[PDB]
Amino acid sequence: LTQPPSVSAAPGQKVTISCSNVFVSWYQQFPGTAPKVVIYDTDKRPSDIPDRFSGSKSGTSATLDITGLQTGDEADYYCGTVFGGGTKVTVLGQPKAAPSVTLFPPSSEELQANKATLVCLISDFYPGAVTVAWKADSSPVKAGVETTTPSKQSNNKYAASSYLSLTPEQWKSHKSYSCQVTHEGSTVEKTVAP
């Protein structure tokens, strides 16, 4: 049912993806490509796939293990009984970098037009997997939220943006609005107010 959004490691190290709340199959899926069974029935692996891939189960959670990591393994990994969330595996080729989070309020022009949009610019982060959560007066918000998918920049780090669309009164009613971004277990929150 639930897996980390991202797992990363240097081009030789071990990656361990964890599927939680559970026979478990693991499917590897490259962009455009169909998902393919990397491991079936907890630990049994198909032929043609390398020895590097191994499946395990501890308690309520089952794990996928990738040893001798290589750029070829850079993919989205899903667990299945239904499917889990998905884990993006990254083969680290540069120092990890925490995103810089810049939260912008609606301009005087946008409000003058009876529109309101908050923009949370997330930039300079590697690996390219981030989680974004909005909060209106310390209370979560998922309605109105729209997030860009990470994109490799000029410096090889990634950049994305999340925006919240609101009514000018919604903006003025709450004393605050926050943008929480999560990158490799490191969370950074920024707030903006009228």
Next chain:
Amino acid sequence: LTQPPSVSAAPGQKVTISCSNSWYQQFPGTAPKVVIYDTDKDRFSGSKSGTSATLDITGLQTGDEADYYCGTVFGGGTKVTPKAAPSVTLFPPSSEELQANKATLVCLISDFYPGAVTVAWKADSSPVKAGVETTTPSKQSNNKYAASSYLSLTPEQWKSHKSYSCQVTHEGSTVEKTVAPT
């Protein structure tokens, strides 16, 4: 398992997907979701004759535009395939940011179809490329696209010029918005 790489249709009609020798729907950036299970099982048909299995989309909506796979091992995949102008929104540097002696402008491009755009910045009609990054489009919830561009400046490099502007091109049309230090 074999499948037609792509199947085209018109909104309000029907579309067919064949699988040779369970059906799953996959939108970008998400896991697949079991639509029909064991030729029977959110209302579409998944009936089959001979060595092949077909999946039919009853009401051809826009929220059904996804990759469809079949299983027993997954089929190769089949991608099931009205113009909207981009909404360009320009933001000045945050009052918070200028107190940290940094400054960034964000050009937010949204609610557009098809998902392909171009960007160009200006600092009083003089085009600038210095510290400009543009993100790649992504299909938002309303089926139309979103992408953003940003310009990194110094608090003085922003307050020196009278105005700043991004210029967004999309299907031969061009949108330009302007911001000036307050």
